[PDB]
């Protein structure tokens, strides 16, 4: 089967560079080109630049051209791309899929995960977890303020997750070159403040695990 | 270059419909159009090939056509699996390019958010900071709009929103607004309102809250 595992994400800081990989299997290396897509939030994909195996011949799109080089590996079958003198518009998601032919003109039959990039230059920092709770009918809605942490990621729960149904954890957003993120459940009225209700925000990054009780009055 | 334009973001459908995303490019393409879907979890697929038509190892179900600049996919009986983010591309000219895409979501009944708003938790205010959070949960379409009116009025400096893709189990969406200010600027002022906006009425859905009575 035709496979194309990309290098996992990485961070770098704005300024520097960085090379990620892509590597082809299943299939025969040098025949078939390696192209590179761009994906921002802001959708849409971008095409970077296509590169041909077998001989080196790359061809880029202007617009990345300068500061972008795709080099390769024809040993290992693996295909790198490297980006310099990062910016934060280069903060995304980076695909690589083979080239291929029917009818005069190429398309990408195969693609990888995608690797992801952040560029920032905040460091491994635990967020403060705020509770949410309503101040001095039947069903209740609480939650609770993940803020000031990075980076991404961080994982909530509700009662060590015996809360599952009507919870929503929300996207997280770049403050201060920080992440910040909120949590909401909702509990009938009778099961808060009667019990316990505690958000459970764990931050691997900064090994931090916080569990925060969402207690009456402001 | 040739800009490749996909009207409709969004598409809502009900599964078992059939289903129709276009794509129209900027000029005459001679038929090298592509089509590749996106699932939620990132991956990338290749649908359809060559304006549409040429297929790879895909279902019956998907379909393609198009010529010169306007092309489309149709997915004949839509399917869970099949919801998901459609782009098409043309091979005809360099650079390579692509449409914005369009992302398919389920049907429901229209359905007014639950809106809630937070003072700031003491916590937080020790720090100096205050922070007033509002949620409007489980509500279609997903278009809407929040408003926070500091003692009465404006307040745009502060706000910062964030959206849920459609929730699995109902079809609902939910967005969550947070206002943040200084210690000393929330104690200068009184009623904090977080105001909802929702076709699912033309009154908004107002919830808000005093100091002076906490």
């Known amino acids: 089967e035709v496979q194309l595992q990309q290098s996992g994400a990485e961070l770098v800081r704005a300024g520097s560079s960085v090379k990620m990989s892509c590597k082809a299997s299943g299939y025969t290396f040098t025949s078939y080109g390696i192209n590179w897509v761009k994906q921002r939030p802001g959708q849409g994909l971008e095409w970077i630049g296509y590169i041909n195996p077998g001989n080196g011949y790359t061809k880029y799109n202007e617009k990345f051209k300068g500061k972008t080089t795709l080099t390769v590996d024809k040993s290992s079958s693996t295909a790198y791309m490297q980006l310099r003198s990062l910016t934060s518009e280069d903060s995304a998601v980076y695909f690589c899929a083979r080239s291929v032919y029917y009818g005069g003109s190429y398309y990408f039959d195969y693609w990888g995960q995608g690797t992801t990039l952040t560029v920032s230059s905040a460091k491994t920092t635990p967020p403060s977890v705020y509770p949410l709770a309503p101040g001095s009918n039947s069903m209740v809605t609480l939650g609770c303020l993940v803020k000031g942490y990075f980076p991404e990621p961080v994982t909530v729960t509700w009662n060590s997750g015996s809360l599952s149904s009507g919870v929503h954890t929300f996207p997280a957003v770049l403050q201060s070159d920080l992440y910040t993120l909120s949590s909401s459940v909702t509990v009938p009225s009778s099961p808060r403040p009667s019990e316990t209700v505690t958000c459970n925000v764990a931050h691997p990054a900064s090994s931090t695990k916080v569990d925060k009780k969402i207690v009456p009055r402001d | 270059d040739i800009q490749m334009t996909q009207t409709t973001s969004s598409l809502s459908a009900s599964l078992g419909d059939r289903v129709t995303i276009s794509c129209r490019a900027s000029?005459?393409?001679?038929?090298?159009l592509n089509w590749y879907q996106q699932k939620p979890d990132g991956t990338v697929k290749l649908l359809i090939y060559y304006t549409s038509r040429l297929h790879s190892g895909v279902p019956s179900r998907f379909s393609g056509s198009g010529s010169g600049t306007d092309y489309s996919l149709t997915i004949s009986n839509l399917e869970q699996e099949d919801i998901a983010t459609y782009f098409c591309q043309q091979g005809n000219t360099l650079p390579r390019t692509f449409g914005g895409g369009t992302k398919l979501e389920i049907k429901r009944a229209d359905a007014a958010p639950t809106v809630s708003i937070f003072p700031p938790s003491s916590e937080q205010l020790t720090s100096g900071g205050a922070s007033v959070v509002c949620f409007l949960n489980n509500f279609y379409p997903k278009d809407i709009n929040v408003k926070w009116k500091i003692d009465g009025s404006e307040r745009q400096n502060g706000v910062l929103n964030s959206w849920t893709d459609q929730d699995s189990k109902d079809s609902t969406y939910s967005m969550s607004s947070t206002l943040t200010l200084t210690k000393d600027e929330y104690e200068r002022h009184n009623s904090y309102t977080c105001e909802a906006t929702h076709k699912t009425s033309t009154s908004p859905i107002v919830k808000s809250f005093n100091r002076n009575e906490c």
């Open positions: 000029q005459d393409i001679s038929n090298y």
